[PDB]
Each structure stands twice: as C-alpha cells, then as structure tokens.
Amino acid sequence: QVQLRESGPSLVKPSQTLSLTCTASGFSLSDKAVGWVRQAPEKALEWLGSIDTSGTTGYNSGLKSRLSIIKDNSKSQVSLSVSSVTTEDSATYYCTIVHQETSRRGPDGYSWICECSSGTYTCDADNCGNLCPSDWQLTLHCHRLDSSTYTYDWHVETWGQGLRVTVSSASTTAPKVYPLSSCCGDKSSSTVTLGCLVSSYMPEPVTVTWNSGALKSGVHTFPAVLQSSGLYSLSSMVTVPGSTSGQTFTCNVAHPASSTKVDKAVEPKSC
C-alpha cells in the first residue's frame, strides 16, 4: 500500500507562489526518490524536478530558477514551490516516485563495464577477466570509455492521483446544486433516471457521489461546461431500476476550493 497524496490550494492568484505538499506513506523517503510532474490542460506531461534519497534536488533545466523542492524524512513529506505563477501554471500536479541512476552504457553491444589498472572499458563479454591483463583483448572486445561519457536513466515508478491547480485572479463561487427530475408523464420507466445540476461554480474540480458513495453502479458524472460568465456547470446522473419506492437519493457535491459540501435530496416529481 504505497500511497502518494498531494495537498494544497486548488486556486492561486497570478504572480503568487504555488506551494504543494506530498505526503508519502507505506514507504520511506530515505529509500525512494520522489519528483513532481504536471500536465496543463490540453498540453503534454511536463517534468518539474525531484529530490533523491541523498537529498540532492534536480530540476527541469528550463524551469529550475522558478522551482524549489524540499523534504522532511521524519514527516515523510515533500513540498513543491513554483514562484510567480501565471495562467500557464494551471495544471494537474502529480507527486511521483522516480527511479534515478547514473550509468555508463557504451556503444550498442558493449553492455558490461570493465575497469582495470589501465582505465575504464566497456566490454562485450562478462569476464573481467581475460581482458584486463591483455592489451590485445581489450582493443578487440572492449571500447575505452572516456572520463566524460555518462548515461542517465529516469522513469516514474508510481504515480499519485494528482491535484488540479487553477491560476486565476477571479474569486471563488460555491456551486448551487439543483435536483434533476423528469417531468410528470415520463414516470413510466422501466428504469428511472434522475440527477443533480451543479451550477455556476469556480474553479474546478468538483466531485459528486450518491448516497454517500453507497450508490456506485448506474452513476455517471459529465464533464463541466464553461459558460462565458467564467462559471462552470456540470451534471451527474444516476439510472436505477424502477420502481424504487422505499429508497431515497442524495447527491453529495464537494467543492474543495471553498471548503463547501452540499448534500441535495433528489425526490421524484410526484403528480
């Protein structure tokens, strides 16, 4: 149960500092390097930086002057700081465990490393061996590795769920949640459909569940429309076998940007 939970503000004003925290659990930061990745809307994944078990930070060369990463092993927390953000820093920020090691791969085919008294060679055979003593075997089966030649290995081992951050000067707006119910005369089912309209909020995201998560199947939450007003709206729908008399339906809406949570009772239109 290796877990990576991002935390921080979902809304930040332009030219301020964006500060995020990643809490690690199920593993120690003294044994695993962790880094930050982000994806802005409609853009590709972008590397930000990492901090390894030794505590050495490394950053996207084109963003380093704006980034700062530090960790606290005892708390198993790692923080990210992005200074003087603009709307281009709006993105989902992912905490990650990254593999990082400096290697020395020679030409393709010379996999093994052979460092003798005469220097460092990349060799094709895994014996080091008959090659080290002989001058003729080295030039045959090995390439002499220059001091500068180094290779780098990087990949993401584990991904966090990601935290969406919006950079905007606009104020927040808590959603107004309206029940969705078909008109009378459409009560003939045989499956009854209802939902909730999460209207006019700012910023994203919003999460929707039904009956406090006890109602799983039959639910679908649509992506949000962005009115020209700058406010978002989305709908969540649940389809359930009818009749369902003797059961209630409540849509639970969470808008973390304003610490507000709404539980709206949805009752079918009785006529």
Binding site: A44, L45, G49, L180, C183, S235
Partner: protein, 213 residues
C-alpha cells in the same frame, strides 16, 4: 520535446506502433519510458529502460529502440487501449526528464452504438431565482461524435446553448451533455422544448412540455 505522431489508429485485435523521435542526448542515451494517460485516471507506466514492462502490464505492450528513435508496439488492440501515450527520457542528467508531444490512439472496428438521450426540465429551486436551465444528457454512443440542436415549438434555437465535447465513460463509449439557459419567463412561454441529437446520420429527439411537469 520528443517528436511523436499526434495520433495513430489501429483496428481491433490488430497491432499498431507509436514512434518517439529525439536526439543523441535523450533517446540516443538509451533509456526510454512510456506512459498511458486515460482521462479521469492517474498516468500509468508501461515501459522503462527501452524494453522492460512495468508491473501489471501485459506482454502485448512492448518497446524497442533504434538509435534516436524509440517505438511502442501494442498488439491485440482492445477498446480500453484508447488513450494518450507519452514517451520520456532523461537528458544530460538523471533528474532532467523530457516528455514527448503525446500520441492519441483510436481503436477502429468497434460496434456502433446509438445515443440514449434524457432531457431534464428546470427545477423549482432554480425557477425561484428567475432562471431556467434545461439539461440534455447524452450517453452510450460510439463513435464519439454527436451534434445537438435545440427546438422551441419546433423551430431551431440559436442562442444560449452550450454543449460539452464527447468524453469516455466506464464502458469505453462516449457521453456528452448540452445546456439551454433560459429565464423563468421563456420556459413558461413556449409550448415545448426539444433536444435533437444526431449521431451517424440518425437523430433522437426528446421533448419537454412546460405545462405538464
């Protein structure tokens, strides 16, 4: 940025390859990784070190590398393989990673599916605020391409309509929604409102009667 094709497509049960072109100092360094991004889900590592499969990844995903170009091959294409795919590589340092431009994969040959349409009238709570939003929810259709037309008393509405782009639901098909923003007066005025959804030349229309809700 590593150069990938913007989009590729293959047929069900067939194979497709995504290339990742770079320079001698990233891809040529010899340690490429591949990631899968399904919207509404965290990114997933597929390949690392050119050819090694990450944990839980089946062998129909495979990677290779030739010089400054890497390739991800996906045989036995299934519906759930539709996603964005990104290659990545270090450059000049094991802590300076570079991602590719990304490739969207479409899986052709899947069965057509018509949209099921539900039209919701405005609620009493919203009408008390002198506003009225009609909600048209469209689901379970493939391919993911619909056009929505709203009608009032049979004539086309040309104002105050907003429609989302189709997006994936759990069953690999597409869903969408459309919103008609009216005032309380308009909703009470007209005799009916209709959401007209066209998908692959065929149309499904649901109608709502303000008087009978």
């Amino acid at each position: 940025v590593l150069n990938q094709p913007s989009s590729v497509s293959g047929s069900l049960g067939q194979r497709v390859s995504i290339t990742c072109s770079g320079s001698s100092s990233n891809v040529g360094n010899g340690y490429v990784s591949w990631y899968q991004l399904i919207p509404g889900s965290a990114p997933r590592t597929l390949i690392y070190g050119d050819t090694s499969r990450a944990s839980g990844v089946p062998d129909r995903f495979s990677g290779s590398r030739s010089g400054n170009t890497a390739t991800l091959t996906i045989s036995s294409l299934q519906a759930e393989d539709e996603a964005d795919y990104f290659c990545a590589s270090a450059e000049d340092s094991s802590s300076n990673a570079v991602f590719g431009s990304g490739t969207t994969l479409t899986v052709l040959g899947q069965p057509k599916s018509p949209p099921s349409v539900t039209l919701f009238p405005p609620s009493t709570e919203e009408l008390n605020g002198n506003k009225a939003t009609l909600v048209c929810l469209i689901s379970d259709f493939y391919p993911g391409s619909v056009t929505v037309v709203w009608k009032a008393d049979g004539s086309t509405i040309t104002r105050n309509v907003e429609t989302t782009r189709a997006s994936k639901q759990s069953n690999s098909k597409y869903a969408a929604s459309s919103y008609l923003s009216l005032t309380s007066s308009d909703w009470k005025s007209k005799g009916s409102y209709s959401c007209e959804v066209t998908h692959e030349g065929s149309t499904v229309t649901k109608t709502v009667k303000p008087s009978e809700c």
